[PDB]
Amino acid sequence: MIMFGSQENKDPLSASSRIGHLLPEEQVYLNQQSGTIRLDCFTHCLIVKCTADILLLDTLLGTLVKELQNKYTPGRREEAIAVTMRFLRSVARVFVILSVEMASSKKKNNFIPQPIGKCKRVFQALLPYAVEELCNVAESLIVPVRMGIARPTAPFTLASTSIDAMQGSEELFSVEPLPPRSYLTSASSLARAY
Amino acid sequence: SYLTSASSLARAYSIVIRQISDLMGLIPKYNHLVYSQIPAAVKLTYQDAVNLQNYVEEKLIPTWNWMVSIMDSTEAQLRYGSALASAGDPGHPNHPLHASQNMSARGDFLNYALSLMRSHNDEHSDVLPVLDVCSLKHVAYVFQALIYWIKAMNQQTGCIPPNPFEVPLAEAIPLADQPHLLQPNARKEDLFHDMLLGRWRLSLELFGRVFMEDVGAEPGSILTELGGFEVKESKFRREMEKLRNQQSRDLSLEVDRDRDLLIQQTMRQLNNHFGRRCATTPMAVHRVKVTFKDEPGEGSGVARSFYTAIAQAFLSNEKLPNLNAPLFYQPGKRGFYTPRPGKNTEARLNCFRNIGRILGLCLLQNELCPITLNRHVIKVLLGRKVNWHDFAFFDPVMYESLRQLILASQSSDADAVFSAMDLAFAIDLCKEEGGGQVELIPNGVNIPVTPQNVYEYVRKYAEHRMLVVAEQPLHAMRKGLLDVLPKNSLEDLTAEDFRLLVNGCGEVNVQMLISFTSFQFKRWFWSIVEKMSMTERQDLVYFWTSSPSLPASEEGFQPMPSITIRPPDDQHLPTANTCISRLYVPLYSSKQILKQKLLLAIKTKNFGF
Amino acid sequence: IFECRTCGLLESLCCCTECARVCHKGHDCKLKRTSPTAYCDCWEKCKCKTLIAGQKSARLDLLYRLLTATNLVTLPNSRGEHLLLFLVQTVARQTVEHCQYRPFAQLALERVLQDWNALKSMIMFGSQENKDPLSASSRIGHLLPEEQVYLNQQSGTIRLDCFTHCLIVKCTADILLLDTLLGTLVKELQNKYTPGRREEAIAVTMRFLRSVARVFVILSVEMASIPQPIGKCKRVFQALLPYAVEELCNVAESLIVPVRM
Amino acid sequence: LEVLPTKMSYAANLKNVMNMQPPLTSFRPQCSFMGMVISHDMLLGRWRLSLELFGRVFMEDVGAEPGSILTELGGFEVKESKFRREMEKLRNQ
Ligand SMILES: [Zn+2]
Ligand SMILES: [Zn+2]
């Protein structure tokens, strides 16, 4: 599951040979990229769409932690870290989107939405690796505003209720990849994400 | 208002960078240019010259890193999108080439944020990255300036040659195989310092289309030089407009519609005009006017009818009045003609000479002259060096058949194979010339070709079929254009540009026609013209603007084509005013029957004013 | 034209700008912006002390001795302009008015630039240890210590820009003045006899080329894609090519920094 | 950061910031951003005027984030709001 996106199932990642290959440099750009749309769909469903049963998330973290401290099997430690790192990148992507959508606690309710609360549980149980991965995620968001990279976009309102936030998130995450054959708003919004 | 300030600061930066480059160009020639002319100037040694260069480079390094990283990132995104188009399929509305690419504010931003996080660890798969290249024009000012620095510092302290190593013609020169890919804006790839300019090929292609009015107005812009048809035709359209309006002497032509008399009348006046003039002095005219008799009315539409009328006389393959063979033929694909040498009489030279003028006259006043020419004959007209790649335009069959011969000569067994063919340096002429073996080199009949000189044999076949057989027409047809257009007005445009300006668009494009013409009746009219056959579109435009084709640019209509809807009347027929290219159609509340009036009007093939 | 309350020159009555600084010095004389067509009326209501011109040969000779014996060229006048700045304004104003003549400032200015002391004062006029009476600075003796710093840093450069702009843009006359300014600068930039002079001439040239680059950029940014004002800026850079390239390198760097960040 | 920021130039200022360069419960944080232990009080005192405009212009957007230092250094404008609303809620109770 986690190492999906790599290898070929149904997408232009598959059939990258002569049929989708005009001299070798076509594959070079098609390679060096690993799919994560399928991975993101699994993560978003497990964090957002599912209920507060909080048993599948514990079950997933139980086996990841168990293999992260396995020594008697040769080479198991290295593949456990690579699996963990890719999974934590997916959770950070969902957490950034969810937190950016929702507004600040202006009503002094002192309540954090359940989907975000599940994201924090993953980060805490994997503290050394989550801290490392959140460092790179933050760097990707603020690098365009360090220079004039722009992509101005347009201002948008901030959702106050949970239901509105779950609306926007699923539009961009429940998506099928592909088959085979105003500037100041963007800077301020990226700075808010950082 | 941020991007306006950032783009202005980038323009101010470029003005300073040019001065450093301009100043540093005077260092080698200081004692001859500055120290002598200026009464009071400093004296420069050599040690401070190299130290000065080190100072400039170290200052410009931070800007170099800023620009290169941005241009590298955008180029990889643009190239990756083109890779996805080839592999992905059309249809699914996220394909880059699908119709949609041509949403809530919240939804629009979340994709940009998601794209950046995915591309940091280079995941970015199966989705086209979000990129608003129209917002990077302050970057384009910086990059264009630093190129100017290194495009001139390199001097201070095309025509594809390869003959061998062939590839199938289907993707080697695709323009030759489908000659209908000549859109006015067709990308050059589809038809067919230095390292950095080629390293960012795609990025410099988008620049010069979105950033040409600003950037490209600068005194040393690469985008202006890198520009293709869109900037070169506008420059030419002004170039011969300047010489058209300055002239105060006009010429009058007078011919009839009859085929035999038309050629006789047209020649009888053209040579008379050259009699009072000189060969060295160009035949530049303010305006040449021709009126057909038995039909009163003078105007622009009459002139357009003439160029088509004179073209059909030479287009056809029948004989001509003696004052003897037809002077054109199609050796390769249909539509593209090559001169017929024939008996090489003095009268034939004038016929090929005088067809040159009408090509220049058409360009001078910017009509269309439907005399389609092969690539090689167009090239020799402009003066560019003919090579062994445009021979593919002469025909696809022979070069491809000849291409296998070099490819087969790459094996040792080909020596035994070559003994079977045992070709010699002799070529049999086509049935066009009446046949007959011709020697490529002296005593070539007794000398059989070998795989050793297949490299040598190939080039002797081409130019024998290219130049010498058509030596006197190509040398005669040339001063036809020469005597009317100046020497220094055609060097910029290539053989590919020349065709679009002379012959216009290859086919009558309805999708361009709608964007060119101006006015529920229209929708019925537009549906009719979509399905009506391709054979008689040329007549409709001939009915429309007295020409079978369309100009390759929107400006090519002087004035713009218009259509006016008259009050309803089912008895009358549509009438076109060619002098203003205005078509009047009665307001018909029916679609199928309206086509009958259009077909009836088209078949008339008559004009009157 | 000017108006004076004390002399009664009002309404239709006016006095020329030459009479304002001599006949009406110290009065309540102010410039007015009305009715551009006029003529002087100073004598009709005042004893005009400007109707007589003296011996011209003695005027120049007197200027020669004052520029040699005395140290008077460094002192600015009551309006804050050093003598060189005043003269350049006169030449620019004169060359427009004097074109309407139907049948000294040029000579003095071309002579003042020829000596090193005047050029040193003009180019470094706003710089510290040189104080403009009318500037908001040179009053820093009663403000808090933190206020006094933040003001020792930064150096006045408006007066230098005004002088440089006039000699390049406004003084559209002959080029003799611009070559004269460079002639004494380059000579003082290659003199090895007087000790402690090379490093001083280097600093003066740096400051001057900074003003030219500031003027050259604004003119080029304003204009669309060669005008004489730009051609004069280009000539200055060529004559001091080693010292112009490095100055332009910093000028370009300052413009692109906010875009880069 | 001992020297008072004096130059009003972005290029020079960026040069300065660059060229100047057991039981687990015993672990203690060690903020030393590019040398020297840094306290929020020192940074707040250094950027004083810049933080007065920030808390007075960007009060509805940047002054609304969780744990923002724009709203607990705020003046009357932020003080008149939370007291009256808190009083109003108590009054209606
Ligand atoms: Zn007075
Ligand atoms: Zn007077």
Cα gap B154→B590, rounded to integer Å? 69
Instruction: List, edge to edge, every strand of the sheet that includes B582-586.
Output: B562-566, B582-586, B575-577
Long-range contacts of C75-83 (CB under 8 A, 24+ apart): C76/C125, C76/C132, C76/C133, C78/C133, C79/C134, C80/C132, C80/C133, C80/C134, C80/C135, C80/C159, C81/C159, C82/C121, C82/C122, C82/C125, C82/C159, C83/C112, C83/C118
Residues of C in contact with A146 (CB under 8 A): 261
- Joined together, the tokens standing for residue B294 give 């038995």
Asked if D64 is an interface residue toward chain A (Cβ–Cβ < 8 A), one would say yes
Residue B582, beta-bridge partner list? B562, B577
User: Which run of H or of E encompasses A133?
Assistant: helix A127-146
Q: Do A188 and D61 touch (CB under 8 A)?
A: yes
C4 labelled binding-site residue: yes
HEC profile of B561-601: CEEEEECCCCCCCCEEECCCCEEEEECCCCCHHHHHHHHHH
Q: Which of B151, B10, B142, B4 is nearest to B67 (CA)?
A: B142
Q: Among residues D34, D31, D26, which one has the least CA distance to residue D1? A: D34
d(CA B431, CA B482): 33
Q: State the method.
A: cryo-EM
Pairing of strands C29-31, C2-4: antiparallel
3-state secondary structure of D69: coil
CA of C28 to the centre of ligand 2 (A): 15
- Closest-CA distance, C250 to chain A, in angstroms, reads 20
Tokens matching residue B276: 């009072």
Q: Cβ of A115 under 8 Å from any chain B Cβ?
A: no
A16 CA: distance to closest CA in chain D (Å): 47
Dihedrals phi, psi of A160, to nearest 5 degrees:
-100, -35
Q: How far apart are CA C72 and CA C88, in angstroms?
A: 18
DSSP, residue by residue, C103-125: --HHHHHHHHTTSHHHHHHHHTS
Count of CB pairs separated by less than 8 Å, A with C:
5
Ligand number nearest to the C-alpha of C25: 1
Chain Cα centroid distance, residue C16: 21
How far apart CA C54 and CA D89 sit, in angstroms, is 91
In the structure encoding, which two tokens stand for residue B585, read together? Answer: 């159609």
Element (H, E) at C3: strand C2-4
Q: Is B294 left (phi over 0), alpha (psi -120 to 50) or beta?
A: left
Task: Considering every ligand atom shown, identify the ligand nearest to the alpha carbon of residue C5 and give its number.
Answer: 1
Beta strands in chain A (DSSP E): none
Q: Which residue has the tokens 């593209």?
A: B336
CB-CB contact of B159 with B168 (8 Å): no
Cβ contact B39:C183 at 8 Å: yes
Q: Determine the residue among A29, A40, A44, A90 to mutate to test chain B binding: the one whose Cβ has the most chain B Cβ atoms within 10 Å.
A: A29
Which residues lie closer than 8 Å to C158 by C-beta, 6 or more apart? Answer: C126
The annotation status of C7 as a binding-site residue, yes or no, is yes
Q: Is B518 helix (H, G, I), strand (E, B) or coil?
A: strand
Taking the C-alpha atoms of residue B142 and residue C255, their distance in angstroms, rounded to an integer, is 11
DSSP for C28-92 reads SEEE--S-S-----HHHHS--TTS----HHHHHHHHHHHHHH---TTS--TTS--HHHHHHHHHH
The span from the CA of B144 to the CA of C225, in Å, is 15
- Would you say C99 is a known binding-site residue? no
B385: phi then psi, degrees, rounded to nearest 5: -75, 120
Nearest-angstrom CA–CA distance, B462 and B439: 13
| Closest listed ligand to the CA of C15 | 2
Q: How many other CB atoms are there within 10 angstroms of residue A113's CB atom?
A: 17
Q: Which two tokens stand for residue C60?
A: 């120049």
- Cβ pair B480, B354 in contact under 8 A: yes
Contact C238 B26 (CB under 8 A): yes
Q: How far apart are CA B323 and CA B345, in angstroms?
A: 11
Resolution in Å, one decimal place: 3.0
Q: Which two tokens stand for residue B160?
A: 């594809």
| N residues, chain C | 261
- Find all residues with CB under 8 Å of B93, minimum gap 6, and list them: B99, B100
For residue A163, the distance in angstroms to the closest alpha carbon of chain D comes to 21
Token pair for B464: 């024998």
Cβ C179–B40 below 8 Å, yes or no?
yes
CA distance B312 to B326: 12
Do residue B16 and residue C213 have CB atoms under 8 angstroms apart?
yes
How far is it, in rounded angstroms, from Cα D46 to Cα D52?
Answer: 12
The Cα-based distances of C51 to B104, C14, C107, C229 in angstroms read 80, 16, 21, 36
Residue with tokens 């399929």: B89
Q: How far apart are the C-alpha atoms of B524 and B589, rounded to whole Å? A: 9
d(CA A154, CA B69): 26
Query: Gap positions in chain A, given as the residue before each gap (C–N > 2.5 A)?
Result: 181
Chain B interface, best mutation among A10, A94, A140, by max B CB count within 10 A: A140
- CA C30 to centroid of ligand 2, rounded, Å: 15
Q: Does the bond joining A12 to the residue before it have cis omega, within 30 degrees of 0?
A: no
Q: Are B331 and B338 in contact (CB under 8 A)?
A: yes
**Strands B338-339, B328-329: parallel, antiparallel or unpaired by DSSP?**
antiparallel
| DSSP code of residue C233 | H
Provide the token pair at B524.
Answer: 């019925």
Residues in chain A: 194
3-state secondary structure of B163: coil
CB atoms within 10 A of CB A124: 10
Using DSSP's 3-state secondary structure scheme, residue B357 falls into: helix
- Amino acid in the structure at residue A58: D
